[PDB]
């Protein structure tokens, strides 16, 4: 079962990427704009992005229409560059979570940090699942062992320790490996026409998908979740604030949105090919990946089984090295974020950062083992950030007069509505039943009502209303000044 040549391919491509990265630091017509756009693009585009996009297009329930994560995450970059970059630079922020700490305080900073940590952990679990899937496909060792060993190598690389300009190299490797495999994948005999499969059903439901009239309010509820929940993220905002000029940051965000839209095209195409593939003709055989509960592995499966041996060896393996190189970047960001926001500011740093790396890697790989979807992990990472952080970001940026009381009230109300609405991915039953609820195969009632958008708006309006209410109570003198536990007013 073990294949030596796949491991050699990963090792050679990883060493080549590392050599280019250290050579860039060894060297250390105004094309810095293009390189900055590539760098901003390479943050979101990784194993999780392309694997989740291919999965979302591949699954019959979703199709391309419900694959809102690439389009929504590009529109998040557009909306950030338009509206969020200029307030952030105008107010002089240096960190994404700095606005929360300035107004709400350090303890509420940690309270808002916890959903950010969980979003980072969901994203890292999706990245670990994608990387383990790719490794398990090409090396042909078991999925669980692949995830464990890949996460362990990433954890040791983060733990032990030049290496400059690597993001452009990983993005170029992913782009070349995908766009040199799509012509071979499309030309495979098993794959039918993807133009015909888009609107008509041959092997499964059409991969464009459809949105029912009742589901439209649901659809926007998802689309607003990914488009607005993808904005308050640390990896985007650190490079936004790092830029010297504001217009430079806006044009970088626009170029990044363009690059994300372009990089989604091979992922959507591979998802379409997987939805169009007659797997009985391929070496994968029957049952197909969605019956095998391996629909989250569709991108490595197409690149391995629908491409020639040399094309597979190069393209799938350049993708593997790039994804493993990008995997440790999320671990580093989340670990430094934990070390600085909680342990350093609120309460020598190297030991606690080491333990943070170890625990975050173990939790991410454990949930990568437990979960069976990459797109679901991506959506769930967006979900909690959209519910909690985004109303608070709107309140600290565009709303004047918000305070800690309204922050906690909106936090509690949004989390109460979100929890009582029920999350099918985490196998949580719903307590409050909005109109249009229906039970799925698992017996978890699924809401057709936009309860997540309602929860977001409720949290935002509760923040505003409770902030102004507490301000009026303390200003007029209705409540005693002694009962000021949060020191907001």
Author numbering: 2 to 29, 47 to 179, 183 to 368, 376 to 517
Quote the study on this structure:
Mammalian sodium-coupled high-affinity choline transporter CHT1 uptakes choline in cholinergic neurons for acetylcholine synthesis and plays a critical role in cholinergic neurotransmission. CHT1 belongs to the mammalian solute carrier family SLC5 which also includes Na+/glucose cotransporters (SGLTs) and is classified as SLC5A7. TMs 1–10 constitute the core of CHT1 with a classical LeuT-fold in which TMs 1–5 and TMs 6–10 form two pseudo-symmetric repeats and TM1 and TM6 are broken into two short helices.
The CHT1apo structure adopts an inward-open conformation with a solvent-accessible vestibule extending from the cytosol deep into the substrate-binding pocket at the center of the transporter. The first occurs at the substrate-binding site where the surrounding aromatic residues, including W62, Y67, Y91, W141, and W406, must reorient their sidechains to accommodate the substrate. The second conformational change occurs at TM8 whose middle part bulges toward the substrate site upon choline-binding.
